[PDB]
Structure 1
Amino acid sequence: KTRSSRAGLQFPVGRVHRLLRKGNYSERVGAGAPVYLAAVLEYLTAEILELAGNAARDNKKTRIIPRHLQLAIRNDEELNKLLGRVTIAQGGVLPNIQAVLLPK
């Protein structure tokens, strides 16, 4: 009997509500906002984790690590933009070498 289960979400609606409420954002908080926001957070999370899981697989690994999260993001146009000014610790960089720098 929790809003998250009621919203069919795996993310804490109650917590999101408590945060929106405590974060000095507005005087009053709608009943649905925590749900909506919680949905959005969860969705974006799934998106990262999937691509990240695929990245882990391609490396023949079962456990996701920073590298995989960096490879997932910098490789996806949209996620890359949404996080263009964020740096993922321990993620390194996409392999890339300017053509003019190659031999022959």
Structure 2
Amino acid sequence: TRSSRAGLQFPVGRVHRLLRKGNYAERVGAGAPVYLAAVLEYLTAEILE
């Protein structure tokens, strides 16, 4: 389930919703919620340490 299937530490089923409610393009590409959680986690980790 999202983190699982994706294999990330970030919420994949949270940024998908905001990107569709922000109202960016007409519909949303399937690519992004998942990809978009990934880089975010990556940045998150780069600072903490």
Q: Normalised by the shorter chain, which TM-score bucket?
A: 0.7 to 0.9
Name the counterpart of 2:6: 7
Query: Structure 1 stretch 24-33 or stretch 37-46: which is displaced more?
Result: 24-33
Give per-residue Cα distances to partners, 1:67-96, cap 9 Å, x unaligned. xxxxxxxxxxxxxxxxxxxxxxxxxxxxxx
Q: Between Structure 1 and Structure 2, whose CA radius of gyration is higher?
A: 1
User: Quick check: which one's helix share is greater?
Assistant: 2
Unpaired runs of 5+ residues, structure 1, are 51-104
Q: CA deviation at 1:20?
A: 0.6
Unpaired runs of 5+ residues, structure 2, are none
Q: How many angstroms apart in 2 are the aligned matches of 1:32 and 1:14?
A: 13
Q: CA deviation at 1:4?
A: 2.0
Give per-residue Cα distances to partners, 1:42-101, cap 9 Å, x unaligned. 000000111xxxxxxxxxxxxxxxxxxxxxxxxxxxxxxxxxxxxxxxxxxxxxxxxxxx
Q: CA deviation at 1:40?
A: 0.6
Q: TM-score, normalised by structure 2?
A: 0.88
Percent identity of equivalent pairs: 98
User: Quick check: which one's strand share is greater?
Assistant: 1
